[PDB]
Amino acid sequence: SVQQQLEALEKSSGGRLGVALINTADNSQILYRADERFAMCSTSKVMAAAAVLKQSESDKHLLNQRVEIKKSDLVNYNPIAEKHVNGTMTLAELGAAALQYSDNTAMNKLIAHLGGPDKVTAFARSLGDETFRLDRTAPTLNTAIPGDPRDTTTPLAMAQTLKNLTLGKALAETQRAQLVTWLKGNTTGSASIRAGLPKSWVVGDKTGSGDYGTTNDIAVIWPENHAPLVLVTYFTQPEQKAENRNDILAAAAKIVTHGF
């Protein structure tokens, strides 16, 4: 019935829905188009921040390293970085801004620090993720053109990697905890996966939206009396100027976390 419910949701939606839920109680999964590629949009910011966290494991000064913010670094959506023009932000602060506010300047500074989008890909590969690819900086990583492989992954690959990052083997403990803290403090996800869940469940997530009405969210969810769930909900539409549809992500989240 869960499969039927997701099929029905997609049927009405006017787009293409991708879901992967991993239930860490038993490693079971709920999958819907989970091996199809979707543009990640800002969900990719998790991988860039995590790559810097990985580096910080072997450089105790890295997270407090100053990064100069200049007016020319501002792009299309940078609510935190714009406050710091002519000043500095630390790499930790850039991670926080990228994840909790989806700050594009912050994402770009993380990418630049790492040595370019391909370094983020290499980090994902180092985690066993064969699917993730980062090709561009922000905001062009949000073009989300149907069939374009740039800046894409699959729901299952991203769920597996988010699990490894937040609950599993990817990062040292202090860094894992930092990533979790960041995701829990996200400000941009109220109407997405979170809106489909019991209000008191603890959740960390990263949203992403782009053209083609591409509307995404990746989450780690801690029920009150059950093992964590890792959930990726990706959604994209056929027309370039389609509205984004966080409601669909909330609906999908409700479907797959029910009976629980």
What's the end-to-end separation, in Å?
15 Å
CATH top level?
A: Alpha Beta
Number of strands: 9
Identify the CATH architecture.
3-Layer(aba) Sandwich
Shape estimate: globular
Largest sheet: 5 strands, antiparallel
Give the H and E element order.
HEEEHEEHHHEHHEEEH
Estimate percent helicity: 25-40%
Which structural traits does this protein have?
alpha+beta; Beta-lactamase; 260 residues; 8 helices
Task: Tell me briefly what this model is.
With 260 residues, this protein is of the alpha+beta class.
Descriptive account of the structure:
It is classed as hydrolase. The entry lists the keywords hydrolase, beta lactamase, neutron crystallography. It forms a monomeric assembly. This protein has a single domain, classed as DD-peptidase/beta-lactamase superfamily (Beta-lactamase), CATH 3.40.710. It is of the alpha+beta class and about 260 residues long. It contains eight helices and nine strands. Helices cover about 35% and strands about 20% of the residues. It starts with a helix and ends with a helix. A five-stranded antiparallel sheet has the order 2-1-9-8-7, sandwiched between helices. It has a two-stranded antiparallel ribbon with strand order 3-6. The longest helix is centred in the N-terminal third of the chain and has 12 residues, at about 1-15.
